Amino acid sequence: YTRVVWCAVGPEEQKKCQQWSQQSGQNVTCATASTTDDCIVLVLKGEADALNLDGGYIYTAGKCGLVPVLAENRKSSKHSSLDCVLRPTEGYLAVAVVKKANEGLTWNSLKDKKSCHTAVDRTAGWNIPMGLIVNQTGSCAFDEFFSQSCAPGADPKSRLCALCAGDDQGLDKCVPNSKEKYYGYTGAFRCLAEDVGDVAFVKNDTVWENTNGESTADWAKNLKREDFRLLCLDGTRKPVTEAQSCHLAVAPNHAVVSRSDRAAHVEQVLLHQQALFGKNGKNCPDKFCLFKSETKNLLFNDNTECLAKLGGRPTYEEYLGTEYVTAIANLKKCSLEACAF
Ligand SMILES: *[C@@H]1O[C@H](CO)[C@@H](O[C@@H]2O[C@H](CO)[C@@H](O[C@@H]3O[C@H](CO)[C@@H](O[C@@H]4O[C@H](CO)[C@@H](O[C@H]5O[C@H](CO)[C@@H](O[C@@H]6O[C@H](CO)[C@@H](O)[C@H](O)[C@@H]6O)[C@H](O)[C@@H]5O)[C@H](O)[C@@H]4O)[C@H](O)[C@@H]3O)[C@H](O)[C@H]2NC(C)=O)[C@H](O)[C@H]1NC(C)=O
Ligand SMILES: *[C@@H]1O[C@H](CO)[C@@H](O[C@@H]2O[C@H](CO)[C@@H](O[C@@H]3O[C@H](CO[C@H]4O[C@H](CO)[C@@H](O)[C@H](O)[C@@H]4O)[C@@H](O[C@@H]4O[C@H](CO)[C@@H](O)[C@H](O)[C@@H]4O)[C@H](O)[C@@H]3O)[C@H](O)[C@H]2NC(C)=O)[C@H](O)[C@H]1NC(C)=O
Ligand SMILES: *[C@@H]1O[C@H](CO)[C@@H](O[C@@H]2O[C@H](CO)[C@@H](O)[C@H](O)[C@H]2NC(C)=O)[C@H](O)[C@H]1NC(C)=O
Ligand SMILES: OC[C@H]1O[C@@](CO)(O[C@H]2O[C@H](CO)[C@@H](O)[C@H](O)[C@H]2O)[C@@H](O)[C@@H]1O
Ligand SMILES: [Fe+3]
Ligand SMILES: [Zn+2]
Ligand SMILES: [Zn+2]
Numbered sequence: 001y002t003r004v005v006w007c008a009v010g011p012e013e014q015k016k017c018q019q020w021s022q023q024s025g026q027n028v029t030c031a032t033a034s035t036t037d038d039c040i041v042l043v044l045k046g047e048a049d050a051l052n053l054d055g056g057y058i059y060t061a062g063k064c065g066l067v068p069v070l071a072e073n074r075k076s077s078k079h080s081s082l083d084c085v086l087r088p089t090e091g092y093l094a095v096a097v098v099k100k101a102n103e104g105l106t107w108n109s110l111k112d113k114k115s116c117h118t119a120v121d122r123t124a125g126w127n128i129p130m131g132l133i134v135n136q137t138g139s140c141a142f143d144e145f146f147s148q149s150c151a152p153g154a155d156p157k158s159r160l161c162a163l164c165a166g167d168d169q170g171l172d173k174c175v176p177n178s179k180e181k182y183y184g185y186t187g188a189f190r191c192l193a194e195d196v197g198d199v200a201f202v203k204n205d206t207v208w209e210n211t212n213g214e215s216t217a218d219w220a221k222n223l224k225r226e227d228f229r230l231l232c233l234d235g236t237r238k239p240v241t242e243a244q245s246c247h248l249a250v251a252p253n254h255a256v257v258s259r260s261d262r263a264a265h266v267e268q269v270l271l272h273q274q275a276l277f278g279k280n281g282k283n284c285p286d287k288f289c290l291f292k293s294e295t296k297n298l299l300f301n302d303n304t305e306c307l308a309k310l311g312g313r314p315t316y317e318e319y320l321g322t323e324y325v326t327a328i329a330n331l332k333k334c335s336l337e338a339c340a341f
Contacts, residue, residue, distance in 0.1 A: 004269045007039035007051040008032045008299065010177030016298045023288040024273065035153075035176050040064065041341060043259060050258035050266045052300055055123040055320055059328050061257050062316030064339040069263045070270055070307040071255040071319075072300060074205070084279075084306035085271070093204040093247040094124035096231040097192060097240070105198060107231040114163060115146040116191030116200040118184045119176045120153030123251040123324075124203045125188055131331040132233075132248060140334035150191055152176040152183045163196050178296065186210065186295060190219055199231065203251070204243040205303055211240075215295050249327075252320050254301060270307055279305050 006021075008014040008030055017030035031048040033039040040061050042048035050069065053061065058068060071089045079087050098105050105113070110133075118125025130142045137145065143160055153176040154160035165181040166173035172180060182191040185206045192200035193210075208214065211223040229237045232246035258266040276282045277290040284290070291304045300307075310319065317325055329336070 001265060002269065003027060003029060004266055005029045005031050005047070005049045006299070007042055007048040009036050009039055009051070010034065010175075010179050012178045012296065013298045016293055019288060020277070020290065020299075023277065023283070027269065028273065037340075040066070043257070044341070046259065049262055050256050052254055052256045054118075054254050055252045055324065056121045056127050056328070058252075058255060058257060058316055058320060059325065060121070060340060062320075063337075064341065065260060066257045066316070067260045067263055068255045068257055068310060068314065068316055068319045069267050071253045071310060072304045073253065073306055073308040074301075074303045075305045085308050086311075087308055088311070089253045089308060091250045091252050092124070093243050094128045094249045094251050095202065095204055095207075095243055095247050096129065097189070097200045097202065097207055098198065098229050098231055098237070099192065099195070100227050100229045102198060105231075106235050106237055107233060108235045110199060110231075111145060112147050113198040114196070115149035115151070116163065116182060116188040116197035117149060117151040118188045118202060120151050120160075124248075125185075125201045126151065127324075127328050127331055128249045128251065129201045131327050134331060134334055142334065149197065150174070150180075150182045150188075152180050152187075163191065165196075178298070185297060185301075193219060193223055201248075204240075204247065207240045209295065209303065217295060220295075249324075252324060255319065256307065257316075274307055278307075 006017055006028055008017040014032040021028050021030050031042055033042055036057050039051050044064055073084055073087055073089055076090055120126050133145055134142055148159050148162035150163035151160045152174055156174045161174035164174040167179045182188060185202045188200045188202050189206050189210055191197045207228060210220045211225040225240050228240055230240055230246045232238060238246045277284050277288050291300050292302060295302060
């Protein structure tokens with residue numbers, strides 16, 4: 001029973017998982033894959049137990065029977081009376097970020113520009129923006145909208161990968177894992193910060209966490225929030241301080257998923273695990289902290305306060321919501337009930 005196998009995506013999450021495994025006295029063990037899709041297959045096969053996912057993948061994993069167990073919960077101002085684990089999730093804001101110095105660039109003049117996406121199939125980095133674009137465009141040719149981009153998970157030979165850089169030696173170009181320089185929230189923001197792309201599709205928090213001395217990372221040390229602007233749907237540009245009134249959509253928090261027949265056992269282990277390495281864990285600051293990885297968001301976003309119970313034992317459809325689910329469906333129509341394997 002009680003031993004849980006976690007699936008790490010890429011060499012960086014593997015090493016973090018191994019530390020976790022070590023400190024957990026084998027209560028947690030690691031399996032590794034080169035992509036989130038592969039990890040999902042390992043979980044379906046039962047060679048793995050769970051992994052934390054972005055809404056976009058939860059849709060995929062859901063169709064194949066996997067279920068949401070616990071969701072990430074970040075520190076919020078409202079609902080302060082309830083404990084983190086019992087507190088309702090609020091979701092994150094999907095935004096489009098651009099350089100202020102790139103005057104004249106608005107949501108209505110994105111065509112033929114350069115884009116930076118977290119990775120194909122993710123919420124803020126792909127489903128939301130590309131979905132809105134396919135609608136407003138009335139075409140399924142989202143592979144021709146931008147001139148060049150870096151969208152991890154696309155054909156390496158396509159313009160959708162043209163801007164990706166791969167690893168320190170140039171290998172793994174465009175792979176959907178942290179080996180790729182511009183992968184995920186941080187990678188997509190860096191892609192913008194280094195003026196590789198004209199626009200980055202990440203989440204509100206990504207801009208705050210990597211500006212004004214919050215990162216210390218060689219490429220973000222001198223980044224100032226004021227040099228950035230948010231593209232709203234009404235064609236307007238606003239400061240990153242107005243995200244509540246200028247976002248593309250609100251996305252459901254990343255959540256841990258396992259097979260339905262194992263969720264109970266995974267839920268038990270995780271709660272006890274975070275009691276030890278969580279934010280105010282018995283051994284987090286001193287020995288190991290599940291939610292830290294120096295702005296790299298490994299296994300879990302670095303801004304996670306705790307993993308929270310769901311309440312209402314929601315199916316994957318109920319967890320993502322009808323709004324979002326229909327959006328992905330309509331966008332999928334471009335690339336009707338299935339399980340991709
Ligand atoms: C976009 O993404 C950004 C990054 O994720 C995000 O900014 C992040 O927001 C969080 C909070 O949501 C910030 O962390 C907070 O920082 C403060 C300052 O360091 C911390 O210090 C205090 O902690 C208190 C306890 O929670 C907090 O009290 C809260 O609750 C009280 C009462 O319940 C209440 O206080 C009010 O005070 C009034 C003035 O006197 C008083 O008259 C009134 O009666 C009332 O009681 C407030 O509700 C209050 O929030 C204190 O206020 C302090 O916060 C705090 O613990 C927490 O760590 C992050 O720093 C920030 N990130 C960055 C990079 O800055 C944006 O908000 C996101 N944007 C959107 C649209 O969501
Ligand atoms: C890209 O573009 C596509 C094409 O437009 C778009 O697809 C659609 O998204 C919209 C919004 O997400 C879907 O909206 C619909 O609203 C109908 C009305 O029901 C809502 O409104 C009620 C009153 O305001 C609310 O009380 C209710 O809670 C709900 O919010 C829905 O229909 C009904 O079901 C009722 C059952 O009680 C019934 O009684 C009614 O007669 C009615 O049939 C409807 O089902 C729908 O949700 C719309 O469905 C989507 N269309 C398709 C074809 O899937 C994408 O959203 C868009 N993508 C992006 C990223 O923007
Ligand atoms: C590995 O899992 C086991 C099972 O929970 C833990 O052993 C329990 O630990 C607590 C705290 O020491 C004791 O109160 C229980 O009596 C133990 N036995 C049970 C309930 O089986 C152990 O703490 C975990 N190890 C690590 C390092 O996380
Ligand atoms: O209010 C959102 C909250 O409600 C739940 C049920 O407790 O889901 C509801 O909203 C979904 C989104 O449209 C529906 O698909 C679902 O049937 C409905 O119950 C939670 O899952 C969600 O967090
Ligand atoms: Fe996401
Ligand atoms: Zn909104
Ligand atoms: Zn239900």
